Structure formats: C-alpha cells, structure tokens
Chains A and B, each alone.
Chain A
Amino acid sequence: QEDISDYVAANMKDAISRTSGVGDVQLFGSQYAMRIWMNPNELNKFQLTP
C-alpha cells in the first residue's frame, strides 16, 4: 500500500491534477516516511534514551 501510494503521489497526482476541468484531487494514502524503529535492548546496551 505504501509503495503504491507514494508512486501515485509522485508521478500520478501532478499530471492528473494538471489537466483541463479538474478541481480538487484527493489522495487516499500517505507518501513515504523514514521510520526509525527503536530496540530497548540495544538502547540499554549503549546507555541511551530516545
């Protein structure tokens, strides 16, 4: 779902919005985002907190 949503937001939203007669264009997904998943064991190992 995320890959498809980002592809639509990148290479489909602009062209579809930039034709004749089209008003608001809404996206039903969310584009990419760099997710950083912590690990409490590793955080404890190096003496670190979020």
Chain B
Amino acid sequence: DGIKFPQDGTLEFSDVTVDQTTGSITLRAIFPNPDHTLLPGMFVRARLE
C-alpha cells in the first residue's frame, strides 16, 4: 500500500554469487517485527542508503 515501516532494519551479508538468468546478486536485510505487521513470502520494496 505504500506505508513506511515505523521500524528500521539493517543490511548484512551482501552475497557474492551472480544469478545466471538475470545477472544480479542478492542481499539480506534484518527487520524487527514486534507487531507481526510483516509476513513471510510477501513482496516488498527496500530503500538502501
């Protein structure tokens, strides 16, 4: 819906392997989820500085 997450996560473990089909790597971020407003498997957008 576009609601900004009240909590902030941190990026850790930027991967090194490169996907063959697309040509991109993956990154992992950790987000605290106390109120269970996030569920596994959903689609989200991430802003990285």
Number of interface residues of B (CB under 8 A): 3
A28 touches B (CB below 8 Å) = no
A47 touches B (CB below 8 Å) = yes
Q: Which B1-42 residues have a C-beta within 8 angstroms of A?
A: 21-23
Instruction: Return chain A residues, CB-CB under 8 Å to B21.
Output: 46-47
A45 touches B (CB below 8 Å) = yes
- Complex: chain B residue closest to A45, CB-CB: B23
For the complex formed, measure the closest distance between the CB of A44 and the CB atoms of chain B, giving whole angstroms: 11
Instruction: Return chain B residues, CB-CB under 8 Å to A46.
Output: 21-23
Which residues of B approach A to under 8 Å, CB–CB? 21-23
Which residues of A approach B to under 8 Å, CB–CB? 45-47
